[PDB]
Nucleic acid binder design. Structure first.
Ligand SMILES: [Mg+2]
Ligand SMILES: [Mg+2]
Ligand SMILES: [Mg+2]
Ligand SMILES: [Mg+2]
Ligand SMILES: [Mg+2]
Ligand SMILES: [Mg+2]
Ligand SMILES: [Mg+2]
Ligand SMILES: [Mg+2]
Ligand SMILES: [Mg+2]
Ligand SMILES: [Mg+2]
Ligand SMILES: [Mg+2]
Ligand SMILES: [Mg+2]
Ligand SMILES: [Mg+2]
Ligand SMILES: [Mg+2]
Ligand SMILES: [Mg+2]
Ligand SMILES: [Mg+2]
Ligand SMILES: [Mg+2]
Ligand SMILES: [Mg+2]
Ligand SMILES: [Mg+2]
Ligand SMILES: [Mg+2]
Ligand SMILES: [Zn+2]
Ligand SMILES: [Zn+2]
Lengths: 109, 50, 117, 292, 59, 54, 169, 188
RNA sequence: ACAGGUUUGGUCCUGGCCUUUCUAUUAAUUCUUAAUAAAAUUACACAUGCAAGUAUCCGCGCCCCGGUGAGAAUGCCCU
RNA sequence: CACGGGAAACAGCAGUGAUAAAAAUUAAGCCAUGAACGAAAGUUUGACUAAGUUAUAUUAAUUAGAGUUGGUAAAUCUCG
């Protein structure tokens, strides 16, 4: 069973920075890196290109990126797998009810 | 007749394993056949057995 | 580095303090430098006899037979050692140099007894 | 019969006989010192730390296994007499594979005689120390185990350090191990110095050279001198286990058995000097009459 | 060492290798000792290949 | 990051050049193995045959 | 370090002492927590302490944190198989989140000791080389053998110029 | 004084001069700054001359470097860490530093001087002497009859047709020397 | 760094500079022998010798060892 | 980057001009090892081995000369 991508990237969570190209999402990825001097972790960012079939990503979304086995272009190594959070519309994974901030829009009962 | 130290080795491991059969350590020279140096070598390609 | 070719070779790499030599049985590439980079350390050899009069050889036979098992070539003195050890049959030039020495010992016993006369 | 050190009787008895002294067990070491760490504790946590210290002291009190004497091995795997003409000194070939137990290693020797022979026990030991260096071990044999150095050291009452010397330096079944072990037990037998090794892990060695050599003298006398009844009774129990059929054993057993009975009966039926054992069993008895 | 594109010596030119002498007893004896040698060795080699196959495919 | 961008155009040129010039200048075996019998000297290869082969 | 209000966590020790190690499936980890409530309390504590330990021990694993999106705190896990784990962290104590994460995807202490054993056997006592990788080097050192000529000049005979001055004459 | 070390250390001259304090107690080294050169001077005693302010050891020639005296060699080694003192600590010249090191070593080796020897468990975990390497194997069918281990350790004189064709090939270059291998070596 | 000297008629404070430690070149003054190691201004120009041969043809080899640090922020690490 | 062009290549071992504060022998062998061929003896190898030259660093003795002496910082007298 051989399907692979040589990139360390295999899965990532990242924000959606821009929609500006056709069927391709510009995704901000944020990792914790240790600064050796201070012994302290900061957010280092990397901008990843992803392929979307639906052209489904509004700007500012929270998106789960899946590695693509064969690279499309030099800069496209990825595929949008799923949308974790839609911007302005978020459904609680726990209770499955719509929310804005700390406010349940639809409460239990 | 398996070479002396290797013979002692095979005997020692089959001894510690729990097998007491004392049969001689016999090696097969069957596939070791070599053509003498006057044998013309075929120049064609590398044979790929699939 | 990147070479054109070559084989995995089990041989003797020479480290030394100059007039007291010491050898390392070493698994390497044929075209890389003598004491240079190697795949894995196999064994060692001590040329000079110690306080008890023993030339010392440490060999790892599991990995020796794994590398010889993967298609490695052995150098002439490595066959001296592995032959003498009994892990391998004695090399033909050991018995040949044997013959040379024996015959030169008879010829020079006859030289000693031709000179005494 | 099958008595041995590793039998649960000899083990539980040598454990209750040895004793735990957390002062001698855990002792100032001449290692590089670091600053002390402190903590505030409840009563309960102090008892807990106590049981903990005892629990580690148990594994520190672990006794080195005693072994009888190995038999020297000489076997020839091969001969070629055309190789005798080389006229070179011995070649020594050693197998190093990290998984192989050190009892399972192949140590080989090829001599000027052009024969393939297996190396001896001392040679196997020093080769496995050259190519698998272990701390405490000297490749060339220590000068300290010479009788002059040994005796000058015994005068220093260092017996535990020579016993520890032998645990690391040599092997449990080797010749010099049992040599200087039993020699140490000798020089603690002549000076009555047994109580040195009391809280030591070397106690089993004492009781198991001395129950076999059949002098229980100074050990029983030093056990009834410190006013320990259960240790002398347990030592008699040991001489009763490792020697089941004998006059003293089955007679002083089948008749009756207790502190007074078995200790006084194995005092009179052990004949080296019974006057000191009966005088000391008279002494701890008059002092058990005075204090109660 | 030298290189492919380096010029050859003036003393290396008129000299092609002059072979060492042959002795018949020693020679034939050697062809045999060696023949049998690489025989048993090419045997132990295939043995070691069986070993490698065993370790790996039982891994 | 690590990015090295640089063209080499004549890395290929020498390849096509050497290959085509190789196949066009490829020695036919008539002149190649041709030998001077007196000197035991190859005019083409400059290679002097061994002393056992004379 | 003085600045910072719990600087003991910027210690190198505190990073190697905190124990959770992650499986080879776990790749991305999301921490979704809340700012205001007494019901998100231990979670923020989990962020402020343990995320340091986790991350240190798990460098290749991306960890992110989202503030005040969902009204109740949780953990999300994204594995290699596309398995999405959900860990509800609400009134949980700090340690309860620690050990429950340890539970779900840990590595058996056995597995750890086995792996580290595999890497320790990679270091062999018998070999000979530079002080970096091994202990002994040229065997100038080892006991019975020959002392090397830097420390102890050898007998006159064993010198090369001695053998050559004897062979010439 | 002769070689005997205990003589001067038990003596009244010593007990007067050094008191109960260690040797080097009152010694002070003189250098260019607040930080002493990182290892002390090679040898203070040269030819017939002793240089300037001599060491604690070598200013008094009644003190001998031996492995015998526990007394002299005690104060040059730490009590509690049980480690020797480097020459900048004590102030002794390096010749005497080395001589003292070999001394204290030969002292610990003869059991004259204490140190720490730790508890180390036995080498093996389980001892089985039962292996085929320790106990003698079943000596081969080639051993019992005294046969050389392979057919080729025994020299066979070749057929004459093969040898004469081997001459027929090599004719101009041939050096033909009979190869019987005299069986026993020794010579003058 | 266990620190030392140095601003002012003087005292603190801030604050650079310098000394005390260790290593490498070259130079000036001196230098008895041996042993071990290391040998290097110069990608300036190079007199003379040598560093690739082997081998019954063919063929195999012929910057592989060895040299240097010119160039390039080059690259370490990891797929 | 070398198809081509200048032009005629030691950044192999020795050695030589120019230049620089910078100075090893135009030395001996393949006897050990590694490498190249070889069926194989074996052949070649300025890699290497053994030397040779150097206070450049350690060891050791046979070998005594240099700096300092207001302070920091070890140590001074009379003249000029
Ligand atoms: Mg001012
Ligand atoms: Mg002033
Ligand atoms: Mg003022
Ligand atoms: Mg200044
Ligand atoms: Mg100079
Ligand atoms: Mg220089
Ligand atoms: Mg040039
Ligand atoms: Mg290079
Ligand atoms: Mg370099
Ligand atoms: Mg830049
Ligand atoms: Mg051109
Ligand atoms: Mg040059
Ligand atoms: Mg060149
Ligand atoms: Mg010049
Ligand atoms: Mg030459
Ligand atoms: Mg030299
Ligand atoms: Mg000097
Ligand atoms: Mg010096
Ligand atoms: Mg002089
Ligand atoms: Mg002063
Ligand atoms: Zn050395
Ligand atoms: Zn001195």
């Amino acid at each position: 069973s051989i399907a692979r991508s040589s990139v360390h990237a295999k899965w990532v969570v990242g924000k959606v920075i821009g929609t500006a190209m056709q069927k391709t999402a510009k995704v901000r990825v944020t990792r914790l890196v240790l600064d050796p001097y201070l012994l302290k972790y900061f957010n280092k960012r990397k901008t990843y290109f992803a392929h979307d079939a639906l052209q489904q990503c509004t700007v500012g979304d929270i998106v789960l990126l899946k590695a693509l086995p064969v690279p499309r272009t030099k800069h496209v190594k990825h595929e949008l797998a799923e949308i974790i959070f839609k911007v302005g519309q978020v459904i609680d994974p726990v209770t499955g009810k719509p929310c804005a901030g700390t406010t349940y829009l639809e409460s239990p009962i | 007749p398996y070479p002396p130290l290797l013979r002692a080795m095979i005997l020692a491991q089959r001894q510690k394993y729990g097998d007491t059969s004392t049969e001689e350590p016999m090696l097969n020279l069957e596939r070791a056949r070599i053509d003498p140096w006057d044998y013309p070598a075929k120049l064609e390609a590398k044979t790929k057995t699939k | 580095r990147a070479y054109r070719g070559g084989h995995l070779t089990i041989r003797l790499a020479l480290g030394g303090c100059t007039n007291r030599p010491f050898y390392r049985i070493v698994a390497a590439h044929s075209k890389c430098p003598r004491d240079g980079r190697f795949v894995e350390q196999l064994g060692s050899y001590d040329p000079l006899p110690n306080s008890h009069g023993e030339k010392l050889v440490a060999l790892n036979f599991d990995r020796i037979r794994h590398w010889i098992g993967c298609g490695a070539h052995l150098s002439k003195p490595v066959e001296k050692l592995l032959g003498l050890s009994g892990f391998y049959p004695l090399h033909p030039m050991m018995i040949t140099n044997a013959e040379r020495l024996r015959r030169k010992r008879a010829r020079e016993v006859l030289l000693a007894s031709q000179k005494t006369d | 019969r099958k008595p041995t050190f590793m039998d649960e009787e000899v083990q539980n008895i040598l454990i209750k006989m040895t004793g735990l002294d957390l002062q001698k067990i855990f002792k100032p070491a001449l290692q590089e010192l670091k600053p002390p760490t402190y903590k505030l504790m409840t009563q309960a946590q102090l008892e807990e730390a106590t049981k903990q210290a005892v629990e580690a002291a148990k594994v520190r009190l672990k006794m080195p296994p005693v072994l009888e004497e190995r038999a020297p091995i000489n076997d020839v795997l091969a001969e070629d007499k055309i190789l005798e003409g080389t006229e070179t000194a011995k070649y020594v070939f050693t197998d190093i594979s990290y998984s192989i137990p050190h009892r399972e290693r192949f140590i080989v020797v090829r001599e000027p005689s052009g024969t393939l022979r297996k190396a001896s026990w001392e040679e196997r030991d020093r080769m496995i120390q050259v190519y698998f260096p272990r701390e405490g071990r000297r490749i060339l044999t220590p000068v300290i185990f010479k009788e002059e150095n040994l005796q000058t050291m015994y005068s220093q009452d260092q017996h535990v350090d020579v016993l520890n010397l032998c645990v690391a330096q040599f092997e449990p079944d080797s010749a010099e191990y049992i040599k200087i072990h039993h020699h140490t037990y000798e020089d603690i037998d002549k000076c009555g110095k047994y109580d040195l090794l009391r809280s030591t892990r070397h106690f089993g060695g004492m009781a198991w050279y001395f129950v076999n050599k059949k002098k229980i003298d100074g050990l029983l006398i030093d056990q009834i001198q410190r006013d320990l009844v259960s240790d002398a009774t347990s030592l008699v129990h040991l001489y009763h286990i490792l020697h089941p059929x004998x006059x003293x054993x089955x007679x002083x057993x089948x008749x009756x058995x207790x502190x007074x009975x078995x200790x006084x009966x194995x005092x009179x039926x052990x004949x080296x000097x019974x006057x000191x054992x009966x005088x000391x069993x008279x002494x701890x008895x008059x002092x058990x009459x005075x204090x109660x | 060492r030298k290189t492919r594109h380096d010029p050859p010596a003036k003393s290396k030119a008129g000299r092609v290798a002059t072979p060492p002498a042959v002795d018949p007893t020693e020679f034939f004896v050697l062809t045999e000792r060696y023949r049998q040698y690489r025989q048993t060795v090419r045997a132990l080699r295939l043995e070691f290949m069986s070993e490698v196959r065993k370790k790996l495919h039982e891994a | 990051a690590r990015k090295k961008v640089r063209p080499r155009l004549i890395a290929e040129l020498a390849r096509r050049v050497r290959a085509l010039r190789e196949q066009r200048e490829r020695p036919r075996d008539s002149q190649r193995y041709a030998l001077d019998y007196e000197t035991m000297m190859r005019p083409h290869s400059g290679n002097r045959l061994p002393m056992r082969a004379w | 370090p003085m600045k910072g209000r719990f600087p003991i966590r910027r210690t190198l020790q505190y990073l190697g002492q905190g124990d959770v190690v992650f499986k080879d499936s776990v790749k991305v980890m999301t921490v979704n927590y809340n700012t205001h409530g007494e019901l998100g309390e231990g979670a923020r504590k989990f962020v402020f302490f343990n995320i340091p330990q986790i991350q240190y021990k798990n460098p290749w694993v991306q960890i992110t944190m989202f503030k005040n999106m969902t009204p109740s705190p949780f953990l999300r896990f994204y594995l290699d198989s596309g398995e999405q784990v959900l860990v509800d962290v609400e009134s949980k104590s700090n340690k309860e989140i620690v050990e429950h994460i340890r539970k779900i995807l840990g590595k058996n202490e056995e597995t750890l000791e086995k792996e580290e054993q595999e890497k320790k056997q990679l270091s062999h006592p018998a070999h000979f080389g530079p002080r970096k990788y091994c202990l002994r080097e040229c065997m100038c050192e080892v006991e019975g053998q020959v002392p090397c000529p830097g420390l102890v000049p050898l007998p006159k005979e064993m010198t090369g110029k001695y053998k050559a001055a004897l062979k010439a004459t | 004084y002769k070689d005997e070390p205990w003589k001067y250390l038990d003596s009244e001259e010593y007990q007067n001069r050094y008191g109960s304090r260690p040797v080097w107690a009152d010694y002070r080294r003189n250098h260019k700054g607040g930080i002493p050169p990182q290892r002390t001077r090679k040898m203070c005693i040269r030819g017939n001359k002793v240089a300037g302010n001599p060491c604690p050891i070598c200013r008094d020639q009644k003190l001998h470097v031996d492995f015998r005296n526990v007394k002299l060699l005690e104060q040059f080694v730490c009590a509690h860490t049980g480690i020797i003192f480097h020459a900048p600590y004590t102030g002794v010249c390096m010749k005497q530093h080395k001589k003292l090191t070999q001394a204290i070593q030969k002292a610990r080796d003869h059991g004259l001087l204490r140190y720490h020897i730790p508890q180390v468990e036995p080498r093996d975990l389980d001892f089985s002497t039962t292996h085929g390497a320790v106990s003698s194997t079943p000596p081969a069918p080639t051993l019992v009859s005294g046969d050389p281990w392979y057919p080729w350790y025994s020299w066979k004189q070749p057929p004459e047709r093969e040898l004469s064709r081997l001459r027929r090939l090599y004719q101009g270059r041939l050096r033909e020397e009979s190869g019987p291998p005299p069986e026993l070596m020794p010579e003058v």
